[PDB]
Amino acid sequence: KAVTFYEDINYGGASVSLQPGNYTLSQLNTAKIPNDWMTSLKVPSGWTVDVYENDNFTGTKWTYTSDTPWVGNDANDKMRSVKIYST
């Protein structure tokens, strides 16, 4: 079980999987996730993904609790930090 983040719409392009945790921009980059890059994601059942517009879990927050082929026009290519929960 992991959250997989995808570069392109409908789970296309480059992908990176992450376990639960609170990942800053620098930490995302080390995990090979660039800024302003995420477009779709797969979320395990029962899990929560809080996607933040700015670093350090600030700015607009978009929340996903299931597989999402398109994050929305506002959220597209905006992720700079993320909190992942298995609850």
- Given candidates 62, 64, 68, 79, which one binds a copy of itself under the rule CB under 8 A? 62
Between strands 81-85 and 48-54, the pairing is antiparallel
Q: How far is the CB of 12 from a copy of itself (least distance, A)?
A: 26
Nearest Cα residue to 80 out of 37, 21, 19? 37
Binding segment for Ca ion (CB under 5 A), chosen from 17-25, 42-50, 61-69, 70-78, is 70-78
Residues in the chain: 87
Q: How far is the CB of 40 from Ca ion (least distance, A)?
A: 8
CB 48 within 8 A of CB 61: no
Between 8 and 53, CB nearer to a copy of itself: 53
Q: Which residues bind Ca ion (CB under 5 A)?
A: 7, 39, 77
